[PDB]
Amino acid sequence: NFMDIECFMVLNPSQQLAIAVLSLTLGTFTVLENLLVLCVILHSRSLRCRPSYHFIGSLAVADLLGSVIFVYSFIDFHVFHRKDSRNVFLFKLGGVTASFTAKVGSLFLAAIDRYISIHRPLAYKRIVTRPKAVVAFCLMWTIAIVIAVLPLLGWNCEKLQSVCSDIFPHIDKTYLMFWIGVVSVLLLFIVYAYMYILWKAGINESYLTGSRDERKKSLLSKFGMDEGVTFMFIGRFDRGQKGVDVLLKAIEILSSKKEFQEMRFIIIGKGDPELEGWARSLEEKHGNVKVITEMLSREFVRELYGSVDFVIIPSYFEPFGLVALEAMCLGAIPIASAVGGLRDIITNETGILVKAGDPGELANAILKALELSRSDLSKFRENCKKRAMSFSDQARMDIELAKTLVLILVVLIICWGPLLAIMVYDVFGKMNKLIKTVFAFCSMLCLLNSTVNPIIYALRSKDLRHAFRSMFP
Ligand SMILES: CCc1c(C(=O)NCCc2ccc(N3CCCCC3)cc2)[nH]c2ccc(Cl)cc12
Ligand SMILES: CCCCCCC(C)(C)c1ccc([C@@H]2C[C@H](O)CC[C@H]2CCCO)c(O)c1
């Protein structure tokens, strides 16, 4: 309590109405459509209860209540020259800082959703549910409320006798660095988060030409073995989760059988030196097993999925169907255990289900594979080709949404970036008359942001538009 509050009302009476009709219209064009964006969401049973678009409510609410507060209390201050209480101002201001912090945490939670929906394609539907998404936003909001009510708890320059900010009344210049700090680094990770998801997302069986018998007759000739039935395993060597130890226990016990001559096995991986010393012995002990644990070209392995006819995923549990999807897309019947996602991607009409970590029943399911016709075999390769299109499909609709989230994050950094940076110089230096009044006119960006956020839903979201013509035809 050294300087009074009126030294902050800088707008002369000609530029207090010009800033008013801006707040009242640009603040009406955001309340109208955000209150409308909330109407499409909660009617459409699709967008309402969905963890993918759940943020569009958490984004159109912080841009509505956080906007009506900033239109009332700002016009009631720079134009109506009102001096509230010392905790009534921080209450009215706390409702604004919480909202912006909340929409940052919305672009943060929506990034966890994006990473899971793309790089955990079938774990996603079972990790990110409606319960786990409702709890994550409510506690993301719980945090956004706390950071906003700190100066109401005693992190202010009045109740602490500290240098006040030249821009915000009743607020320390350290609470700024705690609020600009936690937000600039959050956007930094968030900006870095969506760029990792997009970069590693650009990382078709119509590229492989000819019949499969030809491409498999050319493959086994490279190894020097006869046209045989080619089983394939890909993945790290371990005994903990991948079933390479299970698979080697089956190839050995199948060797004591009459049906082993026709069976051709090919394994690639890298891991336990004793698991490698076990598999490489079979490669020279048998004339029909070849193990490749060195220099595997990523498009050569692409030729394997399309040349072979069976895929072996004997893992104890698949966290994400990385081979399961690429193999089936290239029409190679996968023989995996019904653990993890491999239950609803590999079924009794798409592949062969085995018991996890069971070496005997794995072999008994390799002999079953040897005794079936092309009628069945060509039909499984189709159902593997048909299941994959339902993935590179949704995983395409997912990738389009991680572009939408960046477009929202982009126009968030553009609107709130300059304001945030003008706050930064308040911490270090002082703010003269000019730099303090340009901030009040640049302050309108948090309303323009809430004006272009509902516009870009109606441009990117393919579902939200069709939901709009459904109740307003
Ligand atoms: C239902 C989630 C949701 C919101 C939303 O307001 N969550 C805020 C929930 C919440 C929880 C706790 C508090 N506390 C106040 C301070 C003291 C500690 C507890 C406050 C608020 N907004 C949404 C928009 C769309 C969708 Cl789909 C869901 C939501
Ligand atoms: C660490 C606090 C962050 C504040 C958010 C910045 C924001 C752009 C929302 C903002 C907030 C407040 C004002 C006005 C500053 C004037 O000095 C006093 C009146 C404020 C509006 C009343 C808020 O209840 C602002 O221009 C920008």
Side-chain angles (χ1 to χ4, degrees), residues 295 297-301 303-317 319-342 344-351:
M295 290 183 63
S297 302
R298 314 236 60 80
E299 296 185 6
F300 177 77
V301 172
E303 187 187 1
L304 296 184
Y305 291 119
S307 307
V308 312
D309 51 2
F310 276 107
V311 172
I312 300 190
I313 315 171
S315 306
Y316 288 86
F317 54 97
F320 42 89
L322 68 96
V323 170
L325 284 176
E326 195 184 12
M328 292 168 56
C329 176
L330 291 181
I333 323 169
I335 307 177
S337 188
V339 202
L342 308 182
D344 267 351
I345 178 184
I346 295 175
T347 49
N348 315 316
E349 300 189 344
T350 53

Side-chain angles (χ1 to χ4, degrees), residues 225-238 240-250:
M225 38 192 172
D226 283 332
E227 198 182 12
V229 194
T230 304
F231 297 93
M232 190 193 58
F233 164 80
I234 304 185
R236 185 223 262 169
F237 289 173
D238 55 58
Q241 70 170 19
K242 292 182 181 178
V244 57
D245 58 302
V246 180
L247 175 66
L248 299 180
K249 296 160 185 178

Side-chain angles (χ1 to χ4, degrees), residues 7-15 17-44 46-82 84-119:
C7 202
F8 297 126
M9 321 165 183
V10 197
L11 314 178
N12 67 75
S14 88
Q15 66 186 189
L17 57 97
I19 210 179
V21 300
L22 253 202
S23 304
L24 295 174
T25 49
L26 182 74
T28 302
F29 263 97
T30 166
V31 169
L32 277 194
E33 57 195 53
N34 275 287
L35 183 137
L36 187 141
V37 163
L38 291 190
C39 288
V40 189
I41 293 174
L42 64 89
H43 275 7
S44 310
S46 49
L47 295 105
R48 178 192 69 207
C49 44
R50 252 191 187 181
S52 305
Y53 313 134
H54 183 284
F55 68 88
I56 312 183
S58 179
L59 215 57
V61 162
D63 274 356
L64 196 145
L65 284 190
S67 185
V68 181
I69 295 179
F70 177 79
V71 173
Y72 190 103
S73 50
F74 184 86
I75 300 305
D76 193 46
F77 179 83
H78 277 89
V79 184
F80 276 62
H81 301 296
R82 267 197 50 193
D84 299 307
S85 159
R86 310 189 170 274
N87 285 8
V88 165
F89 179 92
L90 296 174
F91 171 75
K92 295 188 178 184
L93 181 54
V96 201
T97 80
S99 308
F100 162 68
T101 303
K103 62 189 305 191
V104 172
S106 290
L107 292 178
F108 175 81
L109 293 188
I112 297 186
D113 183 289
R114 283 311 91 185
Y115 169 78
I116 302 178
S117 70
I118 295 178
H119 301 71

Side-chain angles (χ1 to χ4, degrees), residues 8 70 73-74 77-78 89 92-93 96-97 167-169 171 175-176 179 416 419 423 439-440 443 446:
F8 297 126
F70 177 79
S73 50
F74 184 86
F77 179 83
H78 277 89
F89 179 92
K92 295 188 178 184
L93 181 54
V96 201
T97 80
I167 172 181
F168 298 113
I171 284 190
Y175 170 82
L176 250 64
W179 186 84
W416 277 84
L419 293 176
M423 303 184 214
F439 176 82
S443 200
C446 78

Side-chain angles (χ1 to χ4, degrees), residues 22 35 182 199 219 461:
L22 253 202
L35 183 137
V182 78
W199 160 72
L219 179 59
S461 187

Side-chain angles (χ1 to χ4, degrees), residues 345-378 380-410:
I345 178 184
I346 295 175
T347 49
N348 315 316
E349 300 189 344
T350 53
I352 308 170
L353 297 83
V354 307
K355 183 167 186 177
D358 201 337
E361 300 194 7
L362 170 59
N364 293 330
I366 302 182
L367 294 172
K368 167 58 205 162
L370 212 61
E371 215 63 27
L372 41 73
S373 191
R374 305 290 179 89
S375 175
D376 295 316
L377 205 151
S378 173
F380 270 170
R381 289 172 42 203
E382 302 305 326
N383 295 3
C384 297
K385 182 182 172 182
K386 297 163 192 173
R387 190 59 51 194
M389 86 181 298
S390 176
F391 279 87
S392 316
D393 184 1
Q394 180 179 345
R396 194 59 211 170
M397 292 177 53
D398 293 358
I399 283 175
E400 291 189 27
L401 186 53
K403 287 175 167 53
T404 295
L405 281 177
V406 173
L407 201 157
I408 298 183
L409 175 68
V410 162

Side-chain angles (χ1 to χ4, degrees), residues 48 54 56-59 61 130 134 137-139 141-142 145:
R48 178 192 69 207
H54 183 284
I56 312 183
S58 179
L59 215 57
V61 162
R130 167 133 286 264
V134 174
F137 275 93
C138 294
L139 292 191
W141 279 87
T142 298
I145 306 300

